[PDB]
Amino acid sequence: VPTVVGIPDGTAVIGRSFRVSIPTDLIASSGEIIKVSAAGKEALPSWLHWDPHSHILEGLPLDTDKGVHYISVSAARLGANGSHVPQTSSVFSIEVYPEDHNEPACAADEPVTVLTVILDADLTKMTPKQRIDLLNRMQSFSEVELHNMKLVPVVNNRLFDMSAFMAGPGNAKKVVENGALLSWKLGCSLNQNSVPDIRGVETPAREGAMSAQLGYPVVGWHIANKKPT
């Protein structure tokens, strides 16, 4: 008598890490083969990665991933002739939303103080796991958890923010790629005198230790107050 497993729908935010556990032990009895894909395709959406050993589906969506993604979790039996005999399939969806509003909140009308690191990188050339690994490797410096950092592409080729009230240089002398912005929240309506200690960002950025850990050149960093939502 076959068992039916429903998986709940999820949500993701452009430029924020996405991570969910998939209940494979419920779906695959009797040593069956699990496949996780976009529904009706063999591959996942470009922003997702499936880790079969931890049972984790994870990703980092870009602007072009906005919208609903249906995900099929299937179990197949391997036949004596090597064929995969499908047994069951469970489909859920993930809706990618456009904006995290710079919030992992601040009062309304209260600007959010954001620290941004500008990287010589092109996120559209990076796999989902590479995007997550880059966020992981920033944790030593930000002291913010992976899921509370934001990672998005540079737009209109702007490698600077003229509203920033603190900033400094990285190790890069040239910028070869389009650029990526890796940012996090410091607080609400801060100024130079209430910003926390940032020597653990600014010194490794300038000396090259941050780029050596992240795997990408650092163009610079800045701190600026961003309009709410």
Residue numbers in the entry: 59 to 162, 179 to 303
Reproduce, without paraphrasing, sentences from the article in which this PDB structure was first reported.
Dystroglycan (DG), a ubiquitous membrane receptor belonging to the glycoprotein complex associated to dystrophin, plays a crucial role in the stability of the plasma membrane, especially in skeletal muscle tissues where it is highly expressed. A single gene, DAG1, encodes for a protein precursor, which is proteolytically cleaved in two subunits, alpha-dystroglycan (α-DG), located at the extracellular side of the plasma membrane where it binds several extracellular matrix proteins, and beta-dystroglycan (β-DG), which is a transmembrane protein that interacts with dystrophin in the cytoplasm. The molecular structure of the N-terminal region of α-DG (α-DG-Nt) was later determined at high resolution by X-ray crystallography, revealing the presence of two domains, an immunoglobulin-like (Ig-like) domain and a domain similar to the small subunit ribosomal protein S6 of T. termophilus (S6 domain), connected by a flexible loop. Noteworthy, it has been shown that α-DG-Nt is necessary for recruiting LARGE and some pathological conditions that are caused by missense mutations in the DAG1 map within the α-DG-Nt.
More recently, two additional mutations, namely V74I and D111N, located on the Ig-like domain surface facing the S6 domain within α-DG-Nt, have been found in a seven years old compound heterozygous patient, who displays mild muscular dystrophy and asymptomatic hyperCKemia. In particular, we focused on the murine α-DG-Nt region, fully validated as a model for the human counterpart, carrying the three pathological missense mutations V72I, D109N and T190M that correspond to their topological counterparts V74I, D111N and T192M in human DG. The crystal structures of D109N and V72I have been determined to a resolution of 1.70 Å and 1.80 Å, respectively. Similarly to what observed for T190M, residues 50–58 and 305–315, as well as residues 163–179 (V72I) or 164–179 (D109N), were missing in the D109N and V72I final models. On the contrary, the single mutant V72I shows a decrease both in Dmax (from 90 ± 3Å for WT to 80 ± 2Å for V72I) and in the Rg value (from 25.20 ± 0.04Å for the WT to 24.20 ± 0.04Å for V72I), pointing to a more compact shape as compared to the WT protein. In detail for V72I the profile is mainly unimodal characterized by a broader single peak: even if its maximum is slightly shifted to more compact models with Rg about 21–25 Å (60.4% of the total population), there is an increased fraction of extended models with intermediate Rg around 25–30 Å.
